[PDB]
Amino acid sequence: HKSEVAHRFKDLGEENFKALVLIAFAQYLQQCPFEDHVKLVNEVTEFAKTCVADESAENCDKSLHTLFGDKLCTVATLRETYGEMADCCAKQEPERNECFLQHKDDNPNLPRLVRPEVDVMCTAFHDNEETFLKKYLYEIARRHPYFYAPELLFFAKRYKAAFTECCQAADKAACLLPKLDELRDEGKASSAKQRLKCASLQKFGERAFKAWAVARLSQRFPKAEFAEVSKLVTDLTKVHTECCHGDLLECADDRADLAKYICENQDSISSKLKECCEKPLLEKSHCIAEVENDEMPADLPSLAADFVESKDVCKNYAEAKDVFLGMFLYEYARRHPDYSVVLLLRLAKTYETTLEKCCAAADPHECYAKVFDEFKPLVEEPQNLIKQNCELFEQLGEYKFQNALLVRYTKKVPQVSTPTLVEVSRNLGKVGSKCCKHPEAKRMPCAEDYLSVVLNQLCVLHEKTPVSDRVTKCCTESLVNRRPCFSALEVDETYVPKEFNAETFTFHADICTLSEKERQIKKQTALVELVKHKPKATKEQLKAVMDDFAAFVEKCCKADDKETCFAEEGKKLVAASQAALG
Ligand SMILES: CCCCCCCCCCCCCC(=O)O
């Protein structure tokens, strides 16, 4: 078109246009005050409106990158506030914008955003609803410069709905609070996954990414032809590559194009794209990415026919190794949407290895004939882990379950920091409840989606402050042996217990007046500390001490005299316990 600006305005709409402009500027000029950005957004918005009325109006023809960069260099304190970045303005558009991307701070040092009081929030909302949401939109954006703008906007709207509903409730807090905790966790998971996909692409390369995408896509579209999956896996890989680099526009168009291609060739891909393809430009991509698995054709022949028994398997394999393997993946994937993606790549890798040994032997059709038999143990392992952990989670309840893990992992890596072991075991328990609630069918895939982010959030910490060679062994290992490696860890027999510390086991009656969250985090921290002091304790010796401490609380926080009870009755517990646990 003649006007790129007028064009984006026209289909985005004024409301979405304005919110995206704000997020965009906030992600670059992360140091300017909110009132400053509002000024820009309005400036840009009024311009856009000019072009929509006459695509010929001066400058209406400039490119978005050009118009954007031009406005960015308009900032007067640019050099004084950002310094080096101001030098970008000396370059010409190809490099200028590339320069801006470079000087983007992924982890700025801004103060943690504290959550105000429901009533203060609801009142700010009611008075000035817009500036309330835009002010917070701007605060999240400057802190997460690499969060895909359109998706940040999708969360924004979900927030506006919670305040809309809850601030009318008789019991606002009971309404709002649990919704905000939910949204918080979601956006955090989304942020991590997005940062994870770009990391792997860099570390493991295109091949591994391609295989992950193939198994992934073949699961959602079991009816498409390998040729179609091939095409998509190809465009997709370019999209993530683009998107990871950073340019919002390049990444936005790449996704739009691919979303339209999928919708046009819809009948050629899946039957569950009905909705997503009827949706607005801004939501088409996001919808599709979240789409449910299409029913896999019911008429699907065997795999042993084309991969184990037929004779020219080596002939077809040597001719094009990757397409053959991609074919195995596609076939096995679309047949098993109840498998995690890493389980599939774990099977594909096993097969590849086997073909490499046999296609170079007297009679291969008999060297690789017992491969499928080697898949059995690979599949049963993650499966036996799910039942076992969901069975347990059922006999205990989230909290009591989180406690079981605590004892488990503290024993494995006692070297790890207590506040870390607690945070980790808490997130694991959450995964236990978020997934064990599904039928066998969707369990494994659920666990992988969640476990993936936790294991990495956990590995990144260790990165900054190493502690155990072992946790480093698994953290550096292949993204396919990441989880299996952690499950393989064994009780540390090397570790040397910590010297007693009464202060660590001294409780004053403030716990009785603390929130559930706080009481638990407090009892849980003593638990980690208790295991670090007496590592060889039994599940019995422990369950006992935990019973005595259990009652204790009730006896001192339901008694006329608190701190005395907590200091006179307490001395009794530690004295007895210290004896029981030898
Ligand atoms: C050296 C022995 C000191 C005894 C201290 C006991 C601390 C254990 C706290 C465990 C609390 C379990 C939580 C619960 O009962 O719900």
Side-chain angles (χ1 to χ4, degrees), residues 471-478 480-498 500-502:
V471 174
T472 292
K473 186 46 246 281
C474 310
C475 275
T476 48
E477 193 107 68
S478 68
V480 143
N481 299 309
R482 209 158 229 231
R483 206 273 311 156
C485 190
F486 274 116
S487 330
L489 284 171
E490 272 151 306
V491 169
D492 198 330
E493 306 275 49
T494 285
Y495 180 85
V496 228
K498 300 259 173 198
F500 189 82
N501 203 302

PDB file of all heavy atoms in Angstrom, residues 471-502, unseen atoms left out:
ATOM      1  N   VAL A 471      23.703 -31.594  39.688  1.00  0.00           N
ATOM      2  CA  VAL A 471      22.617 -30.811  39.121  1.00  0.00           C
ATOM      3  C   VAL A 471      23.116 -30.109  37.865  1.00  0.00           C
ATOM      4  O   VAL A 471      22.329 -29.709  37.002  1.00  0.00           O
ATOM      5  CB  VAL A 471      22.095 -29.774  40.122  1.00  0.00           C
ATOM      6  CG1 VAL A 471      21.074 -28.872  39.451  1.00  0.00           C
ATOM      7  CG2 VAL A 471      21.466 -30.485  41.309  1.00  0.00           C
ATOM      8  N   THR A 472      24.432 -29.971  37.763  1.00  0.00           N
ATOM      9  CA  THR A 472      25.047 -29.337  36.601  1.00  0.00           C
ATOM     10  C   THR A 472      25.136 -30.355  35.460  1.00  0.00           C
ATOM     11  O   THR A 472      25.026 -30.002  34.285  1.00  0.00           O
ATOM     12  CB  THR A 472      26.460 -28.819  36.937  1.00  0.00           C
ATOM     13  OG1 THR A 472      26.357 -27.726  37.856  1.00  0.00           O
ATOM     14  CG2 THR A 472      27.175 -28.349  35.677  1.00  0.00           C
ATOM     15  N   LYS A 473      25.330 -31.622  35.821  1.00  0.00           N
ATOM     16  CA  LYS A 473      25.424 -32.701  34.845  1.00  0.00           C
ATOM     17  C   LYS A 473      24.138 -32.781  34.027  1.00  0.00           C
ATOM     18  O   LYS A 473      24.175 -32.871  32.802  1.00  0.00           O
ATOM     19  CB  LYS A 473      25.665 -34.030  35.564  1.00  0.00           C
ATOM     20  CG  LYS A 473      25.928 -35.204  34.645  1.00  0.00           C
ATOM     21  CD  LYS A 473      26.925 -34.836  33.567  1.00  0.00           C
ATOM     22  CE  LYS A 473      26.271 -34.863  32.199  1.00  0.00           C
ATOM     23  NZ  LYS A 473      26.142 -36.259  31.695  1.00  0.00           N
ATOM     24  N   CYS A 474      23.004 -32.732  34.721  1.00  0.00           N
ATOM     25  CA  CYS A 474      21.691 -32.803  34.093  1.00  0.00           C
ATOM     26  C   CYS A 474      21.262 -31.504  33.439  1.00  0.00           C
ATOM     27  O   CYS A 474      20.567 -31.516  32.424  1.00  0.00           O
ATOM     28  CB  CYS A 474      20.642 -33.188  35.127  1.00  0.00           C
ATOM     29  SG  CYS A 474      21.096 -34.639  36.113  1.00  0.00           S
ATOM     30  N   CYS A 475      21.660 -30.382  34.025  1.00  0.00           N
ATOM     31  CA  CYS A 475      21.275 -29.080  33.491  1.00  0.00           C
ATOM     32  C   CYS A 475      21.967 -28.769  32.169  1.00  0.00           C
ATOM     33  O   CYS A 475      21.407 -28.077  31.313  1.00  0.00           O
ATOM     34  CB  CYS A 475      21.571 -27.979  34.519  1.00  0.00           C
ATOM     35  SG  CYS A 475      20.265 -27.717  35.770  1.00  0.00           S
ATOM     36  N   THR A 476      23.182 -29.285  32.006  1.00  0.00           N
ATOM     37  CA  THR A 476      23.952 -29.067  30.781  1.00  0.00           C
ATOM     38  C   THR A 476      23.623 -30.134  29.730  1.00  0.00           C
ATOM     39  O   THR A 476      23.695 -29.868  28.529  1.00  0.00           O
ATOM     40  CB  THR A 476      25.485 -29.079  31.054  1.00  0.00           C
ATOM     41  OG1 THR A 476      25.827 -30.217  31.857  1.00  0.00           O
ATOM     42  CG2 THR A 476      25.912 -27.801  31.768  1.00  0.00           C
ATOM     43  N   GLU A 477      23.252 -31.331  30.191  1.00  0.00           N
ATOM     44  CA  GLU A 477      22.891 -32.450  29.312  1.00  0.00           C
ATOM     45  C   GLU A 477      21.871 -32.056  28.229  1.00  0.00           C
ATOM     46  O   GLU A 477      21.388 -30.918  28.193  1.00  0.00           O
ATOM     47  CB  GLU A 477      22.327 -33.603  30.148  1.00  0.00           C
ATOM     48  CG  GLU A 477      22.218 -34.915  29.400  1.00  0.00           C
ATOM     49  CD  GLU A 477      23.263 -35.922  29.832  1.00  0.00           C
ATOM     50  OE1 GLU A 477      23.192 -36.400  30.986  1.00  0.00           O
ATOM     51  OE2 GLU A 477      24.155 -36.238  29.020  1.00  0.00           O
ATOM     52  N   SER A 478      21.542 -33.002  27.350  1.00  0.00           N
ATOM     53  CA  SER A 478      20.591 -32.744  26.264  1.00  0.00           C
ATOM     54  C   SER A 478      19.162 -32.541  26.756  1.00  0.00           C
ATOM     55  O   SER A 478      18.700 -33.245  27.657  1.00  0.00           O
ATOM     56  CB  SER A 478      20.615 -33.895  25.260  1.00  0.00           C
ATOM     57  OG  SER A 478      20.099 -35.076  25.840  1.00  0.00           O
ATOM     58  N   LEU A 479      18.464 -31.582  26.147  1.00  0.00           N
ATOM     59  CA  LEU A 479      17.084 -31.273  26.515  1.00  0.00           C
ATOM     60  C   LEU A 479      16.190 -32.515  26.467  1.00  0.00           C
ATOM     61  O   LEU A 479      15.002 -32.451  26.783  1.00  0.00           O
ATOM     62  CB  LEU A 479      16.519 -30.186  25.592  1.00  0.00           C
ATOM     63  N   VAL A 480      16.769 -33.644  26.070  1.00  0.00           N
ATOM     64  CA  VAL A 480      16.034 -34.897  25.990  1.00  0.00           C
ATOM     65  C   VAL A 480      16.384 -35.754  27.202  1.00  0.00           C
ATOM     66  O   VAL A 480      15.605 -36.611  27.617  1.00  0.00           O
ATOM     67  CB  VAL A 480      16.377 -35.655  24.673  1.00  0.00           C
ATOM     68  CG1 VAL A 480      16.440 -37.158  24.906  1.00  0.00           C
ATOM     69  CG2 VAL A 480      15.337 -35.333  23.620  1.00  0.00           C
ATOM     70  N   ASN A 481      17.560 -35.511  27.770  1.00  0.00           N
ATOM     71  CA  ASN A 481      18.008 -36.252  28.942  1.00  0.00           C
ATOM     72  C   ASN A 481      17.954 -35.371  30.181  1.00  0.00           C
ATOM     73  O   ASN A 481      18.457 -35.744  31.237  1.00  0.00           O
ATOM     74  CB  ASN A 481      19.440 -36.758  28.744  1.00  0.00           C
ATOM     75  CG  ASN A 481      19.570 -37.712  27.570  1.00  0.00           C
ATOM     76  OD1 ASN A 481      18.822 -38.685  27.455  1.00  0.00           O
ATOM     77  ND2 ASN A 481      20.530 -37.436  26.692  1.00  0.00           N
ATOM     78  N   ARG A 482      17.343 -34.201  30.044  1.00  0.00           N
ATOM     79  CA  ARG A 482      17.224 -33.259  31.150  1.00  0.00           C
ATOM     80  C   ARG A 482      16.439 -33.852  32.310  1.00  0.00           C
ATOM     81  O   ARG A 482      16.952 -33.974  33.421  1.00  0.00           O
ATOM     82  CB  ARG A 482      16.530 -31.985  30.680  1.00  0.00           C
ATOM     83  CG  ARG A 482      16.941 -30.741  31.427  1.00  0.00           C
ATOM     84  CD  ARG A 482      16.645 -29.500  30.600  1.00  0.00           C
ATOM     85  NE  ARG A 482      17.789 -28.595  30.534  1.00  0.00           N
ATOM     86  CZ  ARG A 482      17.730 -27.299  30.816  1.00  0.00           C
ATOM     87  NH1 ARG A 482      16.576 -26.753  31.182  1.00  0.00           N
ATOM     88  NH2 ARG A 482      18.823 -26.552  30.735  1.00  0.00           N
ATOM     89  N   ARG A 483      15.190 -34.220  32.039  1.00  0.00           N
ATOM     90  CA  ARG A 483      14.309 -34.788  33.053  1.00  0.00           C
ATOM     91  C   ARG A 483      14.770 -36.163  33.539  1.00  0.00           C
ATOM     92  O   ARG A 483      14.875 -36.399  34.745  1.00  0.00           O
ATOM     93  CB  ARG A 483      12.879 -34.876  32.505  1.00  0.00           C
ATOM     94  CG  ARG A 483      11.798 -34.856  33.558  1.00  0.00           C
ATOM     95  CD  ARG A 483      11.515 -36.254  34.079  1.00  0.00           C
ATOM     96  NE  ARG A 483      11.312 -37.210  32.994  1.00  0.00           N
ATOM     97  CZ  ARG A 483      11.496 -38.524  33.101  1.00  0.00           C
ATOM     98  NH1 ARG A 483      11.903 -39.053  34.244  1.00  0.00           N
ATOM     99  NH2 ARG A 483      11.287 -39.312  32.055  1.00  0.00           N
ATOM    100  N   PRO A 484      15.050 -37.091  32.610  1.00  0.00           N
ATOM    101  CA  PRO A 484      15.494 -38.420  33.035  1.00  0.00           C
ATOM    102  C   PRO A 484      16.709 -38.353  33.957  1.00  0.00           C
ATOM    103  O   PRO A 484      16.838 -39.152  34.880  1.00  0.00           O
ATOM    104  CB  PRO A 484      15.807 -39.129  31.723  1.00  0.00           C
ATOM    105  CG  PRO A 484      14.996 -38.424  30.715  1.00  0.00           C
ATOM    106  CD  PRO A 484      14.980 -36.990  31.143  1.00  0.00           C
ATOM    107  N   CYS A 485      17.594 -37.392  33.706  1.00  0.00           N
ATOM    108  CA  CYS A 485      18.796 -37.222  34.523  1.00  0.00           C
ATOM    109  C   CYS A 485      18.475 -36.843  35.975  1.00  0.00           C
ATOM    110  O   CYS A 485      19.110 -37.333  36.911  1.00  0.00           O
ATOM    111  CB  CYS A 485      19.696 -36.149  33.910  1.00  0.00           C
ATOM    112  SG  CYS A 485      21.333 -36.064  34.694  1.00  0.00           S
ATOM    113  N   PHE A 486      17.490 -35.962  36.146  1.00  0.00           N
ATOM    114  CA  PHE A 486      17.074 -35.512  37.464  1.00  0.00           C
ATOM    115  C   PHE A 486      16.369 -36.618  38.214  1.00  0.00           C
ATOM    116  O   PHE A 486      16.497 -36.729  39.429  1.00  0.00           O
ATOM    117  CB  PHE A 486      16.154 -34.303  37.345  1.00  0.00           C
ATOM    118  CG  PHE A 486      16.889 -33.000  37.273  1.00  0.00           C
ATOM    119  CD1 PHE A 486      16.810 -32.208  36.133  1.00  0.00           C
ATOM    120  CD2 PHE A 486      17.684 -32.573  38.335  1.00  0.00           C
ATOM    121  CE1 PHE A 486      17.511 -31.006  36.045  1.00  0.00           C
ATOM    122  CE2 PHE A 486      18.389 -31.377  38.261  1.00  0.00           C
ATOM    123  CZ  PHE A 486      18.303 -30.591  37.110  1.00  0.00           C
ATOM    124  N   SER A 487      15.621 -37.441  37.493  1.00  0.00           N
ATOM    125  CA  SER A 487      14.915 -38.540  38.130  1.00  0.00           C
ATOM    126  C   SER A 487      15.898 -39.631  38.524  1.00  0.00           C
ATOM    127  O   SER A 487      15.614 -40.454  39.392  1.00  0.00           O
ATOM    128  CB  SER A 487      13.865 -39.110  37.180  1.00  0.00           C
ATOM    129  OG  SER A 487      13.383 -38.097  36.324  1.00  0.00           O
ATOM    130  N   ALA A 488      17.061 -39.628  37.882  1.00  0.00           N
ATOM    131  CA  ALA A 488      18.086 -40.636  38.152  1.00  0.00           C
ATOM    132  C   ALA A 488      18.909 -40.330  39.393  1.00  0.00           C
ATOM    133  O   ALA A 488      19.492 -41.240  39.986  1.00  0.00           O
ATOM    134  CB  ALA A 488      19.009 -40.787  36.946  1.00  0.00           C
ATOM    135  N   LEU A 489      18.972 -39.058  39.779  1.00  0.00           N
ATOM    136  CA  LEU A 489      19.731 -38.666  40.961  1.00  0.00           C
ATOM    137  C   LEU A 489      19.405 -39.608  42.106  1.00  0.00           C
ATOM    138  O   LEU A 489      18.295 -40.140  42.190  1.00  0.00           O
ATOM    139  CB  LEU A 489      19.388 -37.239  41.369  1.00  0.00           C
ATOM    140  CG  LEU A 489      20.034 -36.180  40.492  1.00  0.00           C
ATOM    141  CD1 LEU A 489      19.458 -34.820  40.827  1.00  0.00           C
ATOM    142  CD2 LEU A 489      21.534 -36.200  40.704  1.00  0.00           C
ATOM    143  N   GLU A 490      20.377 -39.828  42.981  1.00  0.00           N
ATOM    144  CA  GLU A 490      20.176 -40.707  44.120  1.00  0.00           C
ATOM    145  C   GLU A 490      20.542 -39.977  45.402  1.00  0.00           C
ATOM    146  O   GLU A 490      21.216 -38.942  45.371  1.00  0.00           O
ATOM    147  CB  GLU A 490      21.028 -41.971  43.969  1.00  0.00           C
ATOM    148  CG  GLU A 490      20.343 -43.100  43.194  1.00  0.00           C
ATOM    149  CD  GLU A 490      21.328 -44.000  42.457  1.00  0.00           C
ATOM    150  OE1 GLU A 490      22.154 -43.473  41.675  1.00  0.00           O
ATOM    151  OE2 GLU A 490      21.275 -45.236  42.661  1.00  0.00           O
ATOM    152  N   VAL A 491      20.084 -40.514  46.529  1.00  0.00           N
ATOM    153  CA  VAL A 491      20.368 -39.927  47.830  1.00  0.00           C
ATOM    154  C   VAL A 491      21.865 -39.696  47.977  1.00  0.00           C
ATOM    155  O   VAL A 491      22.657 -40.614  47.786  1.00  0.00           O
ATOM    156  CB  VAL A 491      19.917 -40.861  48.957  1.00  0.00           C
ATOM    157  CG1 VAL A 491      20.465 -40.379  50.286  1.00  0.00           C
ATOM    158  CG2 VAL A 491      18.407 -40.930  48.987  1.00  0.00           C
ATOM    159  N   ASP A 492      22.253 -38.471  48.308  1.00  0.00           N
ATOM    160  CA  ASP A 492      23.664 -38.160  48.484  1.00  0.00           C
ATOM    161  C   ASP A 492      24.190 -38.883  49.722  1.00  0.00           C
ATOM    162  O   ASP A 492      23.651 -38.724  50.818  1.00  0.00           O
ATOM    163  CB  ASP A 492      23.863 -36.652  48.640  1.00  0.00           C
ATOM    164  CG  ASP A 492      25.292 -36.227  48.385  1.00  0.00           C
ATOM    165  OD1 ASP A 492      26.204 -37.040  48.640  1.00  0.00           O
ATOM    166  OD2 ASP A 492      25.506 -35.085  47.929  1.00  0.00           O
ATOM    167  N   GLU A 493      25.230 -39.690  49.544  1.00  0.00           N
ATOM    168  CA  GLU A 493      25.819 -40.429  50.658  1.00  0.00           C
ATOM    169  C   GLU A 493      27.103 -39.733  51.086  1.00  0.00           C
ATOM    170  O   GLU A 493      27.713 -40.084  52.095  1.00  0.00           O
ATOM    171  CB  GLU A 493      26.126 -41.869  50.243  1.00  0.00           C
ATOM    172  CG  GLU A 493      24.939 -42.620  49.651  1.00  0.00           C
ATOM    173  CD  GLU A 493      24.063 -43.257  50.714  1.00  0.00           C
ATOM    174  OE1 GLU A 493      23.703 -42.553  51.682  1.00  0.00           O
ATOM    175  OE2 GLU A 493      23.733 -44.459  50.582  1.00  0.00           O
ATOM    176  N   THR A 494      27.494 -38.735  50.301  1.00  0.00           N
ATOM    177  CA  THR A 494      28.695 -37.951  50.555  1.00  0.00           C
ATOM    178  C   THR A 494      28.436 -36.867  51.602  1.00  0.00           C
ATOM    179  O   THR A 494      29.185 -36.738  52.573  1.00  0.00           O
ATOM    180  CB  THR A 494      29.188 -37.277  49.248  1.00  0.00           C
ATOM    181  OG1 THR A 494      29.802 -38.263  48.409  1.00  0.00           O
ATOM    182  CG2 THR A 494      30.198 -36.176  49.546  1.00  0.00           C
ATOM    183  N   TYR A 495      27.369 -36.099  51.389  1.00  0.00           N
ATOM    184  CA  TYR A 495      26.967 -34.998  52.269  1.00  0.00           C
ATOM    185  C   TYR A 495      27.215 -35.216  53.767  1.00  0.00           C
ATOM    186  O   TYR A 495      26.980 -36.307  54.305  1.00  0.00           O
ATOM    187  CB  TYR A 495      25.483 -34.672  52.037  1.00  0.00           C
ATOM    188  CG  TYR A 495      24.932 -33.542  52.888  1.00  0.00           C
ATOM    189  CD1 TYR A 495      25.069 -32.213  52.491  1.00  0.00           C
ATOM    190  CD2 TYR A 495      24.267 -33.806  54.091  1.00  0.00           C
ATOM    191  CE1 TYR A 495      24.552 -31.174  53.262  1.00  0.00           C
ATOM    192  CE2 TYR A 495      23.748 -32.772  54.871  1.00  0.00           C
ATOM    193  CZ  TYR A 495      23.898 -31.460  54.452  1.00  0.00           C
ATOM    194  OH  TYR A 495      23.388 -30.438  55.218  1.00  0.00           O
ATOM    195  N   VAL A 496      27.690 -34.155  54.422  1.00  0.00           N
ATOM    196  CA  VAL A 496      27.970 -34.165  55.856  1.00  0.00           C
ATOM    197  C   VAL A 496      26.979 -33.233  56.556  1.00  0.00           C
ATOM    198  O   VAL A 496      27.011 -32.019  56.353  1.00  0.00           O
ATOM    199  CB  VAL A 496      29.404 -33.690  56.156  1.00  0.00           C
ATOM    200  CG1 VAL A 496      30.073 -34.657  57.118  1.00  0.00           C
ATOM    201  CG2 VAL A 496      30.204 -33.586  54.867  1.00  0.00           C
ATOM    202  N   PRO A 497      26.087 -33.799  57.389  1.00  0.00           N
ATOM    203  CA  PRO A 497      25.047 -33.101  58.155  1.00  0.00           C
ATOM    204  C   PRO A 497      25.464 -31.781  58.792  1.00  0.00           C
ATOM    205  O   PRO A 497      26.647 -31.535  59.031  1.00  0.00           O
ATOM    206  CB  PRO A 497      24.630 -34.120  59.202  1.00  0.00           C
ATOM    207  CG  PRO A 497      24.887 -35.427  58.558  1.00  0.00           C
ATOM    208  CD  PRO A 497      26.067 -35.250  57.649  1.00  0.00           C
ATOM    209  N   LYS A 498      24.472 -30.939  59.069  1.00  0.00           N
ATOM    210  CA  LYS A 498      24.707 -29.636  59.677  1.00  0.00           C
ATOM    211  C   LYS A 498      24.610 -29.717  61.193  1.00  0.00           C
ATOM    212  O   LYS A 498      23.884 -30.555  61.732  1.00  0.00           O
ATOM    213  CB  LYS A 498      23.691 -28.617  59.159  1.00  0.00           C
ATOM    214  CG  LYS A 498      23.727 -28.419  57.659  1.00  0.00           C
ATOM    215  CD  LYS A 498      24.481 -27.158  57.291  1.00  0.00           C
ATOM    216  CE  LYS A 498      24.660 -27.045  55.786  1.00  0.00           C
ATOM    217  NZ  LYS A 498      25.730 -26.074  55.418  1.00  0.00           N
ATOM    218  N   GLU A 499      25.349 -28.839  61.869  1.00  0.00           N
ATOM    219  CA  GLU A 499      25.365 -28.787  63.330  1.00  0.00           C
ATOM    220  C   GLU A 499      24.076 -28.154  63.836  1.00  0.00           C
ATOM    221  O   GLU A 499      23.612 -27.146  63.289  1.00  0.00           O
ATOM    222  CB  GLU A 499      26.571 -27.978  63.818  1.00  0.00           C
ATOM    223  N   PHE A 500      23.507 -28.749  64.881  1.00  0.00           N
ATOM    224  CA  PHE A 500      22.262 -28.264  65.461  1.00  0.00           C
ATOM    225  C   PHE A 500      22.212 -26.750  65.605  1.00  0.00           C
ATOM    226  O   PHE A 500      23.240 -26.074  65.665  1.00  0.00           O
ATOM    227  CB  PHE A 500      22.019 -28.905  66.825  1.00  0.00           C
ATOM    228  CG  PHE A 500      20.658 -28.623  67.385  1.00  0.00           C
ATOM    229  CD1 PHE A 500      19.561 -29.377  66.989  1.00  0.00           C
ATOM    230  CD2 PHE A 500      20.467 -27.590  68.298  1.00  0.00           C
ATOM    231  CE1 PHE A 500      18.293 -29.108  67.495  1.00  0.00           C
ATOM    232  CE2 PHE A 500      19.203 -27.313  68.811  1.00  0.00           C
ATOM    233  CZ  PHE A 500      18.114 -28.073  68.409  1.00  0.00           C
ATOM    234  N   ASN A 501      20.997 -26.226  65.660  1.00  0.00           N
ATOM    235  CA  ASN A 501      20.795 -24.799  65.793  1.00  0.00           C
ATOM    236  C   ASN A 501      19.393 -24.569  66.326  1.00  0.00           C
ATOM    237  O   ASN A 501      18.422 -24.594  65.572  1.00  0.00           O
ATOM    238  CB  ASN A 501      20.958 -24.129  64.434  1.00  0.00           C
ATOM    239  CG  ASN A 501      21.311 -22.671  64.552  1.00  0.00           C
ATOM    240  OD1 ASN A 501      20.574 -21.892  65.157  1.00  0.00           O
ATOM    241  ND2 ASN A 501      22.444 -22.290  63.980  1.00  0.00           N
ATOM    242  N   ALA A 502      19.295 -24.355  67.635  1.00  0.00           N
ATOM    243  CA  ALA A 502      18.009 -24.134  68.287  1.00  0.00           C
ATOM    244  C   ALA A 502      17.222 -22.987  67.667  1.00  0.00           C
ATOM    245  O   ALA A 502      15.999 -23.065  67.540  1.00  0.00           O
ATOM    246  CB  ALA A 502      18.221 -23.877  69.770  1.00  0.00           C
TER     247      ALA A 502
END
